[PDB]
């Protein structure tokens, strides 16, 4: 239960992975709502838990944090870099181009699928090393999926809320001043001025 | 001339006749009250529209109802 | 300076795309979405005689059914997308 | 020019006379 | 049968009323004997039709005037110096110091002054001389005589539509929003560009020789190309003066944004680019719902599923297809109401952006047309409620709008009705505390003691958009900012110093006193909006009266049972509110005509300390503005203002006739006249001429719609006649 | 018996009544079977018309 | 400087304003003897006067181009006094005015004829109910969380 001494919703029966009976705004009463949701939360985890690796090991390399990587575009005629390296086909033009076209064919294919159960985990093609085998695993690595996506979701806001108050500053940057002198860097100076 | 009209949330007390300024409205046996009584109009090209039976109905709302329409020389009340 | 002649190939990207990639979901919701009807009546069945659909146009010897309705409108998109492309450039 | 000297009594005394007896005959009409 | 002939019980009426009743009821097509849905909508477009023919007859008889009488040539070389002749004057009643006063300009004669603007028009769009107004008046005498033929031919037979034409909503809205809006739109660039830009350059194109100029230097071949930049290239100098090549460019299509150095309006290119972009924006947009061709959009899908899953709306917009389709009070109420909108913005947006030369020095102008418009958007504004309120009465199906949008309203109205008089009796009472204060305070000598409240939140608004008179340094006054980086090399430039220069009307700072007049707008709206409302929703009854439905739009009354019901119908909420309305724009025109006069004479501390209180307002607005009025004429002589005078006398006349009808009712009236019928039948050498009507009192319904319109007219023609005259008593 | 018994408080389900959606109580039944609105109902309030008391069918009272 | 405006205390208007009132005052003055009570009484005006100029200076309010007084009601804690505080005073008063109206209202609800109880007021019961309304704002929320406050 995600609070002791509170009734859960009628809803939330505790069978569904990762489910703890967390909906005070009952967002979910619609059946049809419902499932819609769960994929949705999924895909938001899995795109979240892939960030979080991109976002600190260029950092940790000295390449710079996240949102220097960005300015670049801005510029006119700017070229993008990769391990230092200079892209040739680094133009603002056809970055677009091929970003969109790759992704508008594979996310237009996801959504054409109609059962449900495949729309969260299709297996077949995309499990290659035969984790799905053992049902009595699956549950618990659906869980453990489950718990590690919403704390990756956390990382992300946290990413993001640091950025605001502390600009040109990366969160591996934060963590080094944090451990300098935890006692006068921390939330409290910025939450009261 | 003017339309009247009864419906059977009548009651019988024969208030509405009473109270006509003309001779438009009168009493019919009836069945399906106490009083055993329903009024009629008759007579409505005599009907000026002054709606004082609408002001003597006891019902909630109106029994009679009292619609003005085309306009006589009877029902503008002209004595030229 | 990018040519005006090469950049209008996105006529030919946005004809792919509506014949390869997204025939079927705009099929399937012109399906769904049906005729303009009056009062549960069709506007041609209701009386309009100038609201008949024109069977000889939807007719194609396309392999999917791809029609010229269909050409025109995904070569107008392209054409909007090229002359948004060439005239943002050189500014 | 001489124009204004005809036009407006033209259309201030004669047309309003004109129009209102025909006016007045139409709607005094009956069958 | 007789007069009239679609009214079988009217004709009968052996009294005066036929004729009266006969008259009001003639466009009513619904109430017509053996009227059907047909006839109906082909009556509509034949009205239409006409309508049209009588606007185009309208406009070409203008021009014509103008052109005949006037002194556009002289006009247009010395914009500044000349008053524009609207038409002459032939009265053989006027003596002679009246034809030597009204002599004026460089007229022969007496003569008019024109206020409605049409010389900065069409001097702005490339009119030159006096044989082009006569073309032009031909032309629209050509086009209404082909809307009149037009008209006349759609009730033949033959060429008679039918009902299931009328009711094809999906073409008719591709077709309107395609050519009436994107190719209308596309041609007036054309115009622009081939006439307009290059007449106020010195450069003379008509229809012999228009085939023969390029617009631009390089063809069209930078179109096609896509090198849409080499159009902005040279614009026209800041030294430049208008119709002459001194200083011009070669631009056709610019966002310099701001105005024309000398004639303080807009730049000719930002309009041809404005309108080029809307007609692309509206031809892309014509494209969007399905006809026979086998793509597009169905508005009756569209409307039935939108509704949401939580039943927080019931079944949401299911059904409303056929309630607006069905119905004609609908479509009119949705037209007016989106009209008088953009009226109100036409009003707003054209005194303080002018788009025609020499017409922001043309200080009479500005005030007349601003009142013109928003006394029209509040007319227009009052009919798509009454409209909304037939459509309740007559057109609405309880079973077919099942607890949909439409029919949960009706569940509530208890609700809106309350909270729309609980925001009213707040704004008012405590505005009239405060101008009461301050009104004591300044009686008593003591005016530090006023409550004076700074407008703060549309100071910070107007500093956002880069004004710097009250150093809040936020948005685009910041110049560090992403939004004003993002513009900065466009089109800020020019706004900038547009909007920081305080001799226009672009941004004018405001006081304690436009926190007081906007809080008594908007009081007014409030009231106005709340009356309107209760007259329609109650239209179909109540609990007074449950069966309101039964007795149509207009009634006078239930009878004096049950405690009296005097005007109990939507039609007397629709009477009630017109004076609301009136009220509203007579303070929003007060409000607008005051601060402008403080404005032009150079001494706007005047209204900035005399506007916190009534009496001030009374004092320095009214008392003191009507001196030039009301002298023009004098046991010593008269000038040309003696018809604003008159007008103004006039007025007060008509306005004060109209009490009469208001206050007293029928019944005095039908026993006088009772007895006049008796002296005439019995007086010698009189009695041998009798009636063939019998003489009555106006009916109860017609007696208010006769003092509202005495009432209406009183209002315009005194205010009209103030405003105007002085207005020009002092800045000619 | 029909209806309601005397005493008992019944809601009014008439929509063009002055006390719809309101209570009030019964004050006695008419047994004839060819009486329309036998039910007599009297109310606190009194309606426009300064009556307190009226005639209502089977159907449009119910038991509260 | 909000909005452009300036300090009472240095504003050269508000001095001149100040010294007009006081020349129209004394003018007054000069037609009567000193003992005379109108001397008194001109004097105690002047004092008067003087003694406004001076709070108003000092309670650090914000004068116009017409050496007037404004009021920002925005939420700045600088000028908490011309609009917060009063306004917080004026709802708890109203609130308590219209808590004892309802309770005395609710209160004669149940009696046989509560028409003759509004038009001759029972003195004691109100006078009971009048001391209540000191704590509306509690009874107020709890009547709302336990659902009594809105009509069933
Ligand atoms: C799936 C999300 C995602 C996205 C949108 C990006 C996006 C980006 N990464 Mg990246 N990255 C990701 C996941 C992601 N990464 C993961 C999971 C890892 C761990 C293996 C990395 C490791 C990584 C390195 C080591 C570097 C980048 C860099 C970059 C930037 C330019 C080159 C590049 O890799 O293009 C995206 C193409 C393929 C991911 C670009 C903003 C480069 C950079 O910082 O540029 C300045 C760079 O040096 N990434
Ligand atoms: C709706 C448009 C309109 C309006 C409001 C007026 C209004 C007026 N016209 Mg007029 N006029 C119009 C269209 C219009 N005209 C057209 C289309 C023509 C034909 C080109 C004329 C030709 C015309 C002449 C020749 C004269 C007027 C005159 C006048 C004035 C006196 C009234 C009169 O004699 O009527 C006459 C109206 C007509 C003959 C129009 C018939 C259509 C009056 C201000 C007179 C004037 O200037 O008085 C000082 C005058 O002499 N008008
Ligand atoms: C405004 C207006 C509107 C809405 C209409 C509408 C109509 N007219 Mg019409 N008409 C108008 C003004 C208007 N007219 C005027 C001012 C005149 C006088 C010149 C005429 C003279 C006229 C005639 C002589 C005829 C019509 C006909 C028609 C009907 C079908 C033909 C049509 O327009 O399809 C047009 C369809 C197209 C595909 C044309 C597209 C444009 C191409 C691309 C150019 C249609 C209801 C016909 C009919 O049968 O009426 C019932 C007919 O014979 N009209
Ligand atoms: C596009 C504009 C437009 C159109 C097409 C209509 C059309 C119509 N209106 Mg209308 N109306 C409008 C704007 C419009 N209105 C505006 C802006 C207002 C607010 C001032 C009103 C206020 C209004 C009222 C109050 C009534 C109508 C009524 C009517 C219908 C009958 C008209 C009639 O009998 O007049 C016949 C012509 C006259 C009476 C002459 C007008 C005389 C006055 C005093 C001015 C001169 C007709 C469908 C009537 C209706 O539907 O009754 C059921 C009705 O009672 N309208
Ligand atoms: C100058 C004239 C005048 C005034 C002051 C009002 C004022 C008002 N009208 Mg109104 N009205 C007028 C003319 C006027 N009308 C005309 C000519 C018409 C057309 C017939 C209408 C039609 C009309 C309609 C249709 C409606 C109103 C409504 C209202 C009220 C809502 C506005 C508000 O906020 O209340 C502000 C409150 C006040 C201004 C009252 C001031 C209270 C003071 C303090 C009274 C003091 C009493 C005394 C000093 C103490 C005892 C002394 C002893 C000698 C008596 C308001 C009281 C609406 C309404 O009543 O519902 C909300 C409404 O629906 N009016
Ligand atoms: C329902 C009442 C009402 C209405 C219709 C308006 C309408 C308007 N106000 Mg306004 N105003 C109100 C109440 C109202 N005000 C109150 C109570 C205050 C004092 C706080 C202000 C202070 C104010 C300023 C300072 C300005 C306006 C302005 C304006 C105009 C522009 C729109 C705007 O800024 O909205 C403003 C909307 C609001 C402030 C919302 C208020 C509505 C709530 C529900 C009132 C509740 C009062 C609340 C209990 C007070 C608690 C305070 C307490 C903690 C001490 C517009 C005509 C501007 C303008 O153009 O002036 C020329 C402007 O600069 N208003
Ligand atoms: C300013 C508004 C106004 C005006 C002008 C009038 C005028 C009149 N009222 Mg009156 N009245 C008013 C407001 C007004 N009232 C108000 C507010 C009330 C309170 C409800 C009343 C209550 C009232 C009662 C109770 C009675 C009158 C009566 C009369 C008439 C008196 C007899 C007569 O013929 O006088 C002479 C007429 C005039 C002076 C008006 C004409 C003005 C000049 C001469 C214009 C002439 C133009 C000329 C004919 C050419 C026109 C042609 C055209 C093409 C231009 C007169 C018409 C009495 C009546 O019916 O007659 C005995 C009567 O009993 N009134
Ligand atoms: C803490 C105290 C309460 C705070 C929230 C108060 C509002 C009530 C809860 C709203 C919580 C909530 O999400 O309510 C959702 C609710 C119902 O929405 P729908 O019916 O579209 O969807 C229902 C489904 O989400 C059920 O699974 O209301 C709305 O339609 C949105 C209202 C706010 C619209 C805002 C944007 C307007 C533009
Ligand atoms: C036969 C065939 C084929 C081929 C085909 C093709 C190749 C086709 C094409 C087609 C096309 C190729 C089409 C096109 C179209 C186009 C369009 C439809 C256009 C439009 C345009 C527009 C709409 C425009 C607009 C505009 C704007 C917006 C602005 C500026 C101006 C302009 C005017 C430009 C194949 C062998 C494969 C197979 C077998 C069969
Ligand atoms: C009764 C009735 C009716 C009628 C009604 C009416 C008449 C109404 C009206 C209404 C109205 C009359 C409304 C209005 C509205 C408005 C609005 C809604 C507005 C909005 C605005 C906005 C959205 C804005 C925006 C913006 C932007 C974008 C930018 C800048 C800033 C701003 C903010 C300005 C009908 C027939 C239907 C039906 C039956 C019944
Ligand atoms: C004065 C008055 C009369 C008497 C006035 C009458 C009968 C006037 C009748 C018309 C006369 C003959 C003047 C007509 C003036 C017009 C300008 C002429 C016709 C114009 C056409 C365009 C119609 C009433 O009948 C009445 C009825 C109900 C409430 C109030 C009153 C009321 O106040
Ligand atoms: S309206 Fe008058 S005349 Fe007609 S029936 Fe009723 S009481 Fe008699
Ligand atoms: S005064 Fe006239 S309108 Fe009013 S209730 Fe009596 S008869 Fe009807």
Same mark, same amino acid.
């Given at each position: 239960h995600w609070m002791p001494g509170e009734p859960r919703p009628a809803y939330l029966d505790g069978s569904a992975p990762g489910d703890f009976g967390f909906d005070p705004l009952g967002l979910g009463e619609v059946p049809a709502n419902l499932e819609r949701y769960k994929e949705s939360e999924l895909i938001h985890c899995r795109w979240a838990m892939l960030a979080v690796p991109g976002i600190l090991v260029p950092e940790a390399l000295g390449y710079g944090n996240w949102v220097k990587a960005q300015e670049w575009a801005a510029l006119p005629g700017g070229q993008a870099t990769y391990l230092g390296n200079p892209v040739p086909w680094g133009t603002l033009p056809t970055i677009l181009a091929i970003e969109f076209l790759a992704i508008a064919f594979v996310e237009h294919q996801r959504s054409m699928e109609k059962d449900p159960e495949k729309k969260k985990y299709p297996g077949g093609a995309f499990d290659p090393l035969g984790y799905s085998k053992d049902p009595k695993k699956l549950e618990e690595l659906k869980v453990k999926e489950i718990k590690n996506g919403r704390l990756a979701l956390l990382a992300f806001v946290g990413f993001c809320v640091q950025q605001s108050a502390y600009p040109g500053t990366g969160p591996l940057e934060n963590l080094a001043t944090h451990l300098a002198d935890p006692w006068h860097n921390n939330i409290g100076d910025i939450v009261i001025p | 001339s003017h339309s009247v009209k009864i419906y059977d949330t009548c009651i019988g007390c024969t208030q509405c006749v009473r109270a006509c300024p003309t001779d438009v409205l009168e009493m019919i046996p009836w069945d399906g009250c106490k009083a055993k009584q329903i009024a009629s109009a008759?007579?409505?090209?005599? %009907?000026?529209? %002054?709606?004082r039976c609408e002001s003597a109905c006891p019902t909630d709302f109106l029994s009679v109802r009292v619609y003005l329409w085309h306009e006589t020389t009877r029902s503008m009340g002209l004595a030229y | 300076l990018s040519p005006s002649i090469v950049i209008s190939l996105s006529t030919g990207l946005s004809l792919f795309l509506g014949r390869f990639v997204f025939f079927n979901f705009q099929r399937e919701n012109v399906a769904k979405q049906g005729l303009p009807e009056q009062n549960g009546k069709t506007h041609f069945e209701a009386?309009?005689?100038?609201?008949?659909?024109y069977v000889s146009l939807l007719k194609s010897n396309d392999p999917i059914g791809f029609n010229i309705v269909d050409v025109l409108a995904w070569g107008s998109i392209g054409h909007i997308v090229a002359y948004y492309i060439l005239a943002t450039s050189s500014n | 020019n001489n124009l204004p000297s005809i036009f407006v009594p033209l259309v201030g005394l004669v047309f309003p006379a004109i129009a209102m007896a025909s006016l007045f005959l139409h709607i005094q009409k009956n069958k | 049968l007789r007069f009239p002939r679609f009214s079988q019980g009217l004709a009968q009426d052996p009294t005066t009323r036929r004729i009266w009743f006969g008259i009001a009821t003639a466009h009513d097509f619904e109430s017509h004997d053996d009227i059907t849905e047909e006839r109906l909508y082909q009556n509509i477009f034949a009205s239409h039709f006409g309508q049209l023919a009588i606007i185009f007859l309208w406009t070409s008889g203008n021009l014509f005037h103008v052109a005949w009488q006037g002194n556009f040539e002289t006009w247009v070389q010395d914009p500044l110096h000349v008053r524009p002749i609207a038409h002459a004057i032939w009265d053989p009643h006027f003596g002679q110091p009246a034809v030597e006063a009204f002599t004026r300009g460089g007229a022969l004669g007496p003569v008019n002054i024109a206020y409605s603007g049409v010389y900065q028009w069409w001097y702005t769009i490339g009119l030159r001389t006096n044989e082009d107004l006569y073309t032009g008046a031909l032309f629209l005498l050509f086009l209404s005589a082909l809307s009149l033929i037009g008209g006349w031919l759609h009730l033949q037979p033959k060429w008679k539509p039918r009902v299931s034409w009328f009711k094809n909503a999906e073409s008719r809205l591709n077709h309107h929003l395609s050519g009436l809006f994107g190719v209308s739109s596309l041609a007036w660039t054309g115009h622009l560009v081939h006439v307009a830009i290059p007449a106020s350059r010195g450069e003379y194109v008509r229809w012999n020789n228009f085939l023969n100029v390029? !617009?631009?230097? $390089?063809?069209l071949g930078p179109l096609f190309t896509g090198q849409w930049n080499l159009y902005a290239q040279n614009p026209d100098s800041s030294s430049h003066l208008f119709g002459? @090549? $001194?200083? @011009?460019?070669?631009?056709?299509?610019?966002?310099?944004?701001?105005?024309? !150095? $000398?004639? $303080?309006?807009?730049?000719?290119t930002d309009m041809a680019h404005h309108h080029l972009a809307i007609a692309i924006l509206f031809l892309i947009a014509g494209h969007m719902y399905r006809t026979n061709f086998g793509i597009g959009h169905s508005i009756k899908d569209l409307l039935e599923a939108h509704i949401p899953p939580g039943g927080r709306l019931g079944r949401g917009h299911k059904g409303l297809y056929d309630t607006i389709n069905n119905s004609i009070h609908f479509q009119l109420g949705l037209a007016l109401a989106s009209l008088g909108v953009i009226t109100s913005l036409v009003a707003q947006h054209m005194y303080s952006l002018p788009a025609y030369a020499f017409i922001a020095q043309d200080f009479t102008t500005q005030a007349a047309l601003y009142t013109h418009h928003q006394y029209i958007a509040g007319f227009i504004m009052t009919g798509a409620f009454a409209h909304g309120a037939i459509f309740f009465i007559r057109d609405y199906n309880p079973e077919q709008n099942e607890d949909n949008v439409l029919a949960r309203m009706l569940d509530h109205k208890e609700a809106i009705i309350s909270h729309l008089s609980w925001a009213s009796l707040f704004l008012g009472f405590h505005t009239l505390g405060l101008y009461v204060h301050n009104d004591v305070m300044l009686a008593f000598g003591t005016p530090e003691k006023q409550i004076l409240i700074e407008p703060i939140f549309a100071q910070w608004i107007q500093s956002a958009h880069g004004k710097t008179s009250y150093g809040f340094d936020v948005l685009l006054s910041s110049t560090s900012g992403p939004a004003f980086n993002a513009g900065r090399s466009i089109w800020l430039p020019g706004w900038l110093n547009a909007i920081n220069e305080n001799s226009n009307s672009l941004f004018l700072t405001i006081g304690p006193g436009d926190f007081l007049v906007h809080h008594a707008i908007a009081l007014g709206l409030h009231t106005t909006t709340l009356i309107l409302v209760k007259g329609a929703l109650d239209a179909r009854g109540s609990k007074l009266m449950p069966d309101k439905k039964d007795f149509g739009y207009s009634f006078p009354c239930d009878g004096p049972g049950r405690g009296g019901t005097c005007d109990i119908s939507a039609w007397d909420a629709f009477y009630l509110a017109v004076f609301w309305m009136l009220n509203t724009i007579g303070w929003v025109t007060f409000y607008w005509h005051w601060k402008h006069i403080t404005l032009w004479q150079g001494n706007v501390s005047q209204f900035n300390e005399s506007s916190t209180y009534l009496m001030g307002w009374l004092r320095d607005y009214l008392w003191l503005n009507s001196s030039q009025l009301i002298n023009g004429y004098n046991p010593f002589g008269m000038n040309s203002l003696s018809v604003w005078a008159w007008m103004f006398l006039f007025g007060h006349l008509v306005w004060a006739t109209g009490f009469m009808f208001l206050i007293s009712w029928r019944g005095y009236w039908q026993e006088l006249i009772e007895t006049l019928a008796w002296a005439h039948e019995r007086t010698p050498l009189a009695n041998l001429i009798r009636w063939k009507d019998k003489p009555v009192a106006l009916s109860i319904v017609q007696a208010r719609l006769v003092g509202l319109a005495h009432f209406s007219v009183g209002y315009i023609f005194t205010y009209a006649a103030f405003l105007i005259a002085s207005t020009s008593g002092k800045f000619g | 018996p029909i209806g309601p018994k005397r005493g008992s408080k019944v809601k009014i389900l008439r929509r063009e009544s002055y006390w719809f959606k309101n209570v009030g109580s019964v004050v006695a039944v008419d047994?004839?079977?060819?009486?329309?609105?036998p039910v007599v109902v009297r109310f606190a309030k009194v309606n426009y018309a300064n009556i307190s008391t009226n005639n209502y069918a089977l159907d449009e009272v119910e038991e509260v | 400087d909000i909005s452009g405006l300036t300090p009472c205390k240095d504003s050269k208007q508000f001095a001149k304003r100040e010294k007009q009132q006081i020349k129209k005052l004394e003018?007054?003055?000069?037609?009567?003897?000193?003992?005379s009570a109108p001397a008194l009484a001109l004097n105690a005006q002047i004092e008067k006067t003087k003694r406004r100029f001076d709070n108003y200076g000092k309670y650090g309010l914000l004068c116009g181009s017409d050496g007037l007084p404004h009021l920002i009601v925005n939420g700045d804690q600088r000028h908490w006094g011309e609009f917060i505080t009063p306004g917080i005073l004026f709802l708890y008063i109203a609130g308590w005015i219209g808590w004892v109206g309802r309770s005395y209202l609710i209160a004669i609800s149940g009696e046989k004829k509560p028409a003759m109880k509004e038009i001759i007021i029972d003195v004691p019961l109100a006078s009971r109910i009048i001391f209540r309304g000191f704590i509306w704002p509690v009874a107020a929320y709890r009547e709302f969380l336990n659902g009594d406050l809105i009509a069933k």
């Open positions: - | 008759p007579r409505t090209e005599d %009907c000026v529209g %002054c709606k | 009386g309009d005689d100038r609201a008949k659909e | - | 390029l !617009p631009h230097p $390089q063809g002459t @090549s $001194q200083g @011009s460019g070669t631009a056709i299509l610019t966002l310099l944004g701001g105005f024309h !150095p $000398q004639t $303080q309006s807009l730049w000719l | 047994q004839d079977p060819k009486t329309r609105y | 003018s007054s003055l000069k037609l009567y003897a000193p003992e």
